[PDB]
Amino acid sequence: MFTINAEVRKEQGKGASRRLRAANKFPAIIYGGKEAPLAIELDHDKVMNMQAKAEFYSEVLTIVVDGKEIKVKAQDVQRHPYKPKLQHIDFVRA
Amino acid sequence: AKKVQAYVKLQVAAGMANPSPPVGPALGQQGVNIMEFCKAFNAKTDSIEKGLPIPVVITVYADRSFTFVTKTPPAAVLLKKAAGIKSGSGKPNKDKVGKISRAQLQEIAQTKAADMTGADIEAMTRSIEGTARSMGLVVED
Amino acid sequence: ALNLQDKQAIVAEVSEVAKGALSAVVADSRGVTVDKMTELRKAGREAGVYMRVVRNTLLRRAVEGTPFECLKDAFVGPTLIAYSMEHPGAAARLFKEFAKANAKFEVKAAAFEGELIPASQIDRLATLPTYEEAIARLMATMKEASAGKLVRTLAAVRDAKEAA
Amino acid sequence: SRVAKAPVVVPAGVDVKINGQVITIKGKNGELTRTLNDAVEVKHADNTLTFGPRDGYADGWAQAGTARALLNSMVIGVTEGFTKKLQLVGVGYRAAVKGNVINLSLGFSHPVDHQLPAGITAECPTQTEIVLKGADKQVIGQVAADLRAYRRPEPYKGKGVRYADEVVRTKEAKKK
Amino acid sequence: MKVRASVKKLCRNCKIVKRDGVIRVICSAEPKHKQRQG
RNA sequence: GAUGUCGGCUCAUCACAUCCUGGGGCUGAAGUAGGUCCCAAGGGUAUGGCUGUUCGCCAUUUAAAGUGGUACGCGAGCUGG
RNA sequence: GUGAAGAGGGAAACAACCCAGACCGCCAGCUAAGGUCCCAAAGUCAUGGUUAAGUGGGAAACGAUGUGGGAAGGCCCAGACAGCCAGGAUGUUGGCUUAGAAGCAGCCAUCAUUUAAAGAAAGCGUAAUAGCUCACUGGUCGAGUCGGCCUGCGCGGAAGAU
């Protein structure tokens, strides 16, 4: 359903990641296949109102980063300490 | 509140609406004087049998003006009669207390025809099917 | 767009028949009342005339999706439509059955054999023998004027010479 | 919100006079029929009323439907004259008009001295039935609302002064 | 009527209306529903 | 190197989550009356016995016999029991 | 860490708080935590968003039809969503139960009819038939509207010795 965008990591680690969530972004990853793990940044509230309809999980994702598309389905979820809001999501290739 | 109900219900034998209890409370509550209704009703009942329930559907307007429609005897009365039963089972469908043929059902249907809204004489039969079904008569093809 | 199909199907279902009707009648009631509707369902199945009560929302999407003749200027506001594709006279009689239980100023328009009929003209028009009874009355009008009238006149002159 | 976009188009020979936020309706057969927008701005234009947000506010839609409603109400007040027919159920109460005075009983040993405002008038056909006259939709119901205050249509046997929106639903007695 | 706290719909004609800083249940079906604090 | 205790009188004072008149909703409240019930500190709010004593038991007043604090009010006042 | 074994600044103040570690003298400037209308020294600061409770600047469970923005999306002038108004029908006051038991006292059937259409009924309410709202049907109606979620702000909950 959803057509979203991503940036390739300027900065990685816990120190890095707190300054993304300060600016209302968070990180993510696309693993699987014969090919390398694609580490990405997303925007938090770009997805937060998408995954409010169940179509985020029933249908595959258009995620474009450095103009590359490989298609993606959701995996297990990392959550903030006191909100169901997304601290980090895992993804698998489709 | 205007205090209107459309298509107010009665089912009563033709010669017994003088007392209020056979008629129940609802006619009073829509403002139809029970005595006045019984007189208006008697003029078309002289060809009806004593004790036999006659269907009556009333519309009452806001200003307590009323009009009243009188109907041919029930499907429920005719089916009890044709089956030789005084009363229903009180349990529909799972308890059988008799059976009724499609060919008897079609005659029950033709006696109700002028009230029936159906476009086929079968359509009519299918409406009275469920009257047989409520009273514990199985509807055989 | 709508999420469900119900509203879009029913526009096509009326449009087919409503372009088709040889007479139709577009009327006002805004709460048609079920006592009347049932007696008009009852005598419509005698004449094979069909009747629908229908929203101006359905009809206005009908004017957009489909071209109409002689009925579409009358689809604004509260509307019943009684219609026949068969027996044109009975369709126009249906409004005289409804006028027995209702107000007669309520027609906005009619169509008759593709003619637009205004709200004031139909009340004369509508007496309307059906197409078989009409054709036979026209056919008698010409058979009579051809040879019967000639003789009427040839008699009337012989009668004046007859002296009493 | 459908009704904050409504342009009204006020009838012929009604004068709707704008001091900005006080808007004043005059015409034949009455005086002091008026409306105040206080949160929102109403421009009158030539006759197409335009409703929007006011300076020094944050608040939205709240007074803009009211202003449309209340102005149209007042334009019909002076144009046709608003509905007049009042009545009451219950023995021995009355509402018999004699001049500026509405005559009633409340069982009291003092005269009740229920009186009509100087800006309205009334008459009576029969001793429990009232006909009120004026061109203001607010006032006629305000003097009715104080005459009902402690004689409001009861939920049980319905007795009260009856006009406009009414709460009575009827009850049957307790089982014996 | 009970004074209460937390405002709820007592019936389909409880409109629920904010008078001053407290939400009141105000109904035009039944006077039974006039709930004082919300 | 002394912040020292109980109950009652006299004399009090302050909090209202009001004993009562008062204004008002609901009611399975017809009205009445009661059940349910909100605002309200303004004002009135009983006595003899036995016990160290509040509370008790008993006789008794009036329409009535309240709620809470005060070095658990008040021994540089009293009974100091 | 501080006091114990330290002065000064800020907190309505204090023997441990937060900043800071008094050699003295100097009507000297900057910075910290903290502040910037008057007490009282400095911003009634510029731009945008929003509430109307002294929330702010006092705390929870809890709740709803309190109120706005936002992005993503269904509905969406070809007519919305919701109310208000009018229709709510044929068998049929089905069978049992009963004073009548009739959509709404109880229990069983949970159906069929001409229908563009009306559940042998979702919820209310003196036991109840009632009165009422309700989809669905059609008016009024000609523009925003609602479910989910992010988010600013609210609420009542929050009654006592001076």
Swiss-Prot record, chain A:
This is one of the proteins that binds to the 5S RNA in the ribosome where it forms part of the central protuberance. Binds to the 5S rRNA independently of L5 and L18. Not required for binding of the 5S rRNA/L5/L18 subcomplex to 23S rRNA. Disulfide bonds: none annotated. One of its GO terms (biological process) is ribosomal large subunit assembly. The keyword Ribosomal protein applies. The gene is rplY. InterPro entries: Rbsml_bL25/Gln-tRNA_synth_N, Ribosomal_bL25/Gln-tRNA_synth, Ribosomal_bL25_short, Ribosomal_L25_dom, Ribosomal_uL5_bac-type. This is Large ribosomal subunit protein bL25. It comes from Escherichia coli (strain K12). Keywords: Ribonucleoprotein, Ribosomal protein, RNA-binding, rRNA-binding. Pfam families: Ribosomal_L25p. One of its GO terms (molecular function) is structural constituent of ribosome. Belongs to the bacterial ribosomal protein bL25 family. The keyword Cell cycle does not apply. Part of the 50S ribosomal subunit; part of the 5S rRNA/L5/L18/L25 subcomplex. Contacts the 5S rRNA. GO terms for cellular component: cytoplasm; cytosol; cytosolic large ribosomal subunit.
From Swiss-Prot, chain B:
Part of the ribosomal stalk of the 50S ribosomal subunit. Interacts with L10 and the large rRNA to form the base of the stalk. L10 forms an elongated spine to which 2 L12 dimers bind in a sequential fashion forming a pentameric L10(L12)2(L12)2 complex. Gene3D superfamilies: Ribosomal protein L11, C-terminal domain, Ribosomal protein L11/L12, N-terminal domain. PROSITE patterns: RIBOSOMAL_L11. The modification N6-succinyllysine is found at residues 71, 80. GO terms for cellular component: cytoplasm; cytosol; cytosolic large ribosomal subunit. InterPro entries: Ribosomal_uL11, Ribosomal_uL11_bac-typ, Ribosomal_uL11_C, Ribosomal_uL11_C_sf, Ribosomal_uL11_CS, Ribosomal_uL11_N, Ribosomal_uL11_N_sf. Belongs to the universal ribosomal protein uL11 family. The modification N,N,N-trimethylalanine is found at residue 1. The keyword Ribosomal protein applies. This is Large ribosomal subunit protein uL11. CDD domains: Ribosomal_L11. Keywords: Methylation, Ribonucleoprotein, Ribosomal protein, RNA-binding, rRNA-binding. It comes from Escherichia coli (strain K12). The modification N6,N6,N6-trimethyllysine is found at residues 3, 39. Pfam families: Ribosomal_L11, Ribosomal_L11_N. GO terms for molecular function: large ribosomal subunit rRNA binding; rRNA binding; structural constituent of ribosome. Forms part of the ribosomal stalk which helps the ribosome interact with GTP-bound translation factors. GO terms for biological process: cytoplasmic translation; ribosomal large subunit assembly; stringent response; translation; translational termination.
UniProtKB/Swiss-Prot annotation, chain C:
The keyword Acetylation applies. The modification N6-acetyllysine is found at residues 36, 104. PROSITE patterns: RIBOSOMAL_L10. It comes from Escherichia coli (strain K12). Ribosomal protein L8 appears to be an aggregate of ribosomal proteins L7/L12 and L10. It comes from the Bacteria. This is Large ribosomal subunit protein uL10. One of its GO terms (biological process) is cytoplasmic translation. GO terms for cellular component: cytoplasm; cytosol; cytosolic large ribosomal subunit; large ribosomal subunit. Keywords: Acetylation, Repressor, Ribonucleoprotein, Ribosomal protein, RNA-binding, rRNA-binding, Translation regulation. One of its GO terms (molecular function) is ribosome binding. Forms part of the ribosomal stalk, playing a central role in the interaction of the ribosome with GTP-bound translation factors. Protein L10 is also a translational repressor protein. It controls the translation of the rplJL-rpoBC operon by binding to its mRNA. Disulfide bonds: none annotated. InterPro entries: Ribosomal_uL10 (IPR001790), Ribosomal_uL10-like_sf (IPR043141), Ribosomal_uL10_bac (IPR022973), Ribosomal_uL10_bac_type (IPR047865), Ribosomal_uL10_CS_bac (IPR002363). CDD domains: Ribosomal_L10 (cd05797).
Curated annotation (Swiss-Prot), chain E:
One of its GO terms (cellular component) is cytosolic large ribosomal subunit. InterPro entries: Ribosomal_bL36, Ribosomal_bL36_sp. GO terms for biological process: cytoplasmic translation; translation. The keyword Ribosomal protein applies. GO terms for molecular function: rRNA binding; structural constituent of ribosome. Pfam families: Ribosomal_L36 (PF00444). Keywords: Ribonucleoprotein, Ribosomal protein, RNA-binding, rRNA-binding. One of the last ribosomal proteins to be assembled in the 50S subunit, it contacts a number of helices in the 23S rRNA, acting as molecular glue. The simultaneous presence of uL16 and bL36 probably triggers ObgE's GTPase activity and eventual dissociation from the mature 50S ribosomal subunit. Belongs to the bacterial ribosomal protein bL36 family. Part of the 50S ribosomal subunit. NCBIfam families: rpmJ_bact. This is Large ribosomal subunit protein bL36A. It comes from Escherichia coli (strain K12).
